[PDB]
Design an enzyme around this catalytic site. Structure first.
Site, short mmCIF file in Angstrom:
data_model
loop_
_atom_site.label_atom_id
_atom_site.label_comp_id
_atom_site.label_asym_id
_atom_site.label_seq_id
_atom_site.Cartn_x
_atom_site.Cartn_y
_atom_site.Cartn_z
N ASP A 25 0.73 -1.23 -0.07
CA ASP A 25 0.01 -0.08 -0.17
C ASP A 25 0.86 1.33 -0.09
O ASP A 25 1.29 1.67 0.95
CB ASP A 25 -1.01 -0.13 1.39
N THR A 26 1.11 2.09 -1.29
CA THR A 26 1.93 2.96 -1.30
C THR A 26 1.02 4.15 -0.65
O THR A 26 1.83 5.24 -0.63
CB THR A 26 2.01 3.40 -2.76
N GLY A 27 -0.04 4.15 -0.33
CA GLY A 27 -0.88 5.32 0.38
C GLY A 27 -0.89 5.32 2.04
O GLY A 27 -1.31 6.06 2.39
C1 LIG Z 1 -5.03 8.99 3.97
C2 LIG Z 1 -4.43 8.22 3.09
C3 LIG Z 1 -5.08 6.57 3.03
C4 LIG Z 1 -6.81 7.00 3.04
C5 LIG Z 1 -4.40 6.02 4.15
N1 LIG Z 1 -4.87 4.45 4.14
C6 LIG Z 1 -4.22 3.72 3.34
C7 LIG Z 1 -5.20 3.44 2.19
O1 LIG Z 1 -4.62 2.75 1.04
C8 LIG Z 1 -6.45 2.68 2.70
C9 LIG Z 1 -6.12 1.03 3.10
C10 LIG Z 1 -7.24 0.46 3.50
C11 LIG Z 1 -7.83 -0.79 2.26
C12 LIG Z 1 -9.22 -1.56 2.44
C13 LIG Z 1 -9.96 -1.21 4.02
C14 LIG Z 1 -9.18 -0.43 4.99
C15 LIG Z 1 -8.06 0.50 4.59
N2 LIG Z 1 -7.31 2.40 1.44
C16 LIG Z 1 -8.59 3.01 1.34
O2 LIG Z 1 -9.12 3.55 2.30
O3 LIG Z 1 -9.29 2.89 0.39
C17 LIG Z 1 -10.61 3.43 0.13
C18 LIG Z 1 -10.80 3.80 -0.81
O4 LIG Z 1 -11.28 2.73 -1.96
C19 LIG Z 1 -11.46 1.49 -1.26
O5 LIG Z 1 -10.79 0.58 -1.31
C20 LIG Z 1 -10.27 0.09 0.03
C21 LIG Z 1 -10.97 1.00 1.18
C22 LIG Z 1 -11.56 2.08 0.12
S1 LIG Z 1 -5.22 4.03 5.71
O6 LIG Z 1 -5.46 2.55 5.79
O7 LIG Z 1 -6.45 4.83 6.42
C23 LIG Z 1 -3.80 4.42 6.87
C24 LIG Z 1 -2.73 3.35 6.57
C25 LIG Z 1 -1.34 3.50 7.71
C26 LIG Z 1 -1.21 4.81 8.21
O8 LIG Z 1 0.00 5.22 9.04
C27 LIG Z 1 0.22 6.41 9.54
C28 LIG Z 1 -2.14 5.94 8.42
C29 LIG Z 1 -3.69 5.68 7.51
#
Ligand SMILES: CC[C@H](C)CN(C[C@@H](O)[C@H](Cc1ccccc1)NC(=O)O[C@H]1CO[C@H]2OCC[C@H]21)S(=O)(=O)c1ccc(OC)cc1
EC number: 3.4.23.16
Lengths: 99, 99
Positions: A25-27
Site C-alpha cells: 500500500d503506497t498510500g
Molecule cells: C490518508 C491516505 C489513506 C486513506 C490512508 N490509508 C491507506 C489506504 O490505502 C487505505 C488502506 C485500506 C484498504 C481497505 C480497507 C481499509 C484501509 N485504503 C482506503 O481507504 O481505500 C478506500 C478507498 O477505496 C476503497 O478501497 C479500500 C477501501 C476504500 S489507511 O488505511 O487509512 C492508513 C494506513 C497507514 C497509516 O500510517 C500512518 C495511516 C492511515
C-alpha cells in the site's frame, strides 16, 4: 516482480512466526496489521484514514518477510479490516511505482 | 516515471479544469477526492476505510489527468483525509508496483 493493479496487490508476509496476506500500500505511511498477540513492549498510537481514527499498538524493530524480501521496522497492530504494508517497509524491499 | 517511496507519492492532477495534489494509493480500490464542485450528475454512495464509512457523491466517467497521463473513470467526493488516486484510475495510466 511486477504487480499490476487490476486486483488488490495482496502478497504473503511472515511476521511473528505467522503467515498472512497483506496489501502493498503506497498510500499508507506506516504498516498496520490485524490484531495479533505479539510479545514485547509497545506504545499506543492513533492513525487516521477514511472513516476516522483507530487505536493501534506500535511495535518497533519487528522482523517481517514480504514476498521473500526481509525487512525490519515499525508495525502497528489493531482492529484494521486489512493488513497493509506501508512505505516504511516498502522502501526496504525496493518497491517502486512505475508508469 | 519510476517513483520511490521514501516520501509520499504525491502528484498533481487535473480534474474539472482545476489542478490539485493527490496521493497515488495502491491500497485504495477507488479514487476519493476532498469536497469540491464538479459538473455533471452524481449519486450518493457509501465507502469504507480503516476508520469506518463516509458518505460520498459518486461522479461517473470523469476526465482526470494524473501526472500527465489521462484517465476517465469514477471519482468519489467527500470527507476523505486526503485526495487519493485508487486502482480504478491507476490501472488506466499503466501503473504497476515493482520490486
Ligand atoms: C490518508 C491516505 C489513506 C486513506 C490512508 N490509508 C491507506 C489506504 O490505502 C487505505 C488502506 C485500506 C484498504 C481497505 C480497507 C481499509 C484501509 N485504503 C482506503 O481507504 O481505500 C478506500 C478507498 O477505496 C476503497 O478501497 C479500500 C477501501 C476504500 S489507511 O488505511 O487509512 C492508513 C494506513 C497507514 C497509516 O500510517 C500512518 C495511516 C492511515
Amino acid at each position: 516482480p511486477q504487480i499490476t493493479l487490476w486486483k488488490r496487490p495482496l502478497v504473503t508476509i511472515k511476521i511473528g512466526g505467522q503467515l498472512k496476506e497483506a496489501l502493498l500500500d503506497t498510500g499508507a505511511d506506516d504498516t498496520v496489521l490485524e490484531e495479533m498477540n505479539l510479545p514485547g513492549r509497545w506504545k499506543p498510537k492513533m492513525i487516521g484514514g477514511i472513516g476516522g481514527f483507530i487505536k493501534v499498538r506500535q511495535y518497533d524493530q519487528i522482523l517481517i518477510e514480504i514476498c521473500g524480501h526481509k525487512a525490519i521496522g515499525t508495525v502497528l497492530v489493531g482492529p484494521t479490516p486489512v493488513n497493509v504494508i506501508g512505505r516504511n517497509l516498502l522502501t526496504q524491499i525496493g518497491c517502486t511505482l512505475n508508469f
